[PDB]
Amino acid sequence: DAIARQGQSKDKVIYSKYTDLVPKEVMNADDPDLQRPDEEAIKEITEKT
């Protein structure tokens, strides 16, 4: 991955492995992983931006 990023810092995400290409398993609809970051954090991001 140090071949992939040259001057870019480690905060920027780079997709390079084969495991980035395989699909994840289909999972539950009611789950906090696939959820919005909720109204107070959206409002804080909105006011900061």
Partner 1 sequence: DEEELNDYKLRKRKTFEDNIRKNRTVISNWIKYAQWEESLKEIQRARSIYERALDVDYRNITLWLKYAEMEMKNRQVNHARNIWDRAITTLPRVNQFWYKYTYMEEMLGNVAGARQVFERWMEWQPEEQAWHSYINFELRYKEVDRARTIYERFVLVHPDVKNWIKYARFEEKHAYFAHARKVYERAVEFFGDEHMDEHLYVAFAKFEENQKEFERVRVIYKYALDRAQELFKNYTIFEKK
Partner 2 sequence: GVWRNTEDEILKAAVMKYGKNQWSRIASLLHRKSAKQCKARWYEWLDPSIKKTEWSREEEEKLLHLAKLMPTQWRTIAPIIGRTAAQCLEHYEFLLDKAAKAREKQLEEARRLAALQKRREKRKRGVDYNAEIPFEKKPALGFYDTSE
Partner 3 sequence: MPKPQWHPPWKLYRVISGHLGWVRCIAVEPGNQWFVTGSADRTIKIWDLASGKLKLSLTGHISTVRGVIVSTRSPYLFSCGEDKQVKCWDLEYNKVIRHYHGHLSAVYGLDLHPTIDVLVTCSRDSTARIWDVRTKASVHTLSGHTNAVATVRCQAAEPQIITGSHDTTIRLWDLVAGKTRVTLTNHKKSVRAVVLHPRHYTFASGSPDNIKQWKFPDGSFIQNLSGHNAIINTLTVNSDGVLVSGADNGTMHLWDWRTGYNFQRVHAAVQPGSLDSESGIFACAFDQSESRLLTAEADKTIKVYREDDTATEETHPVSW
Binding site for partner 1 (CB under 8 A): 3-4, 16-18
Residue 37 binds partner 3, judged by CB under 8 A = yes
Stretch that binds partner 2, among 1-9, 11-19, 26-34, 35-43 (CB under 8 A): 1-9
Q: How far is CA 42 from CA 6, 34, 35, 36, 45, in A?
A: 33, 16, 13, 9, 5
Q: Is 6 among the residues that bind partner 2 (CB under 8 A)?
A: yes
Residues that bind partner 2 (CB under 8 A): 2-3, 6
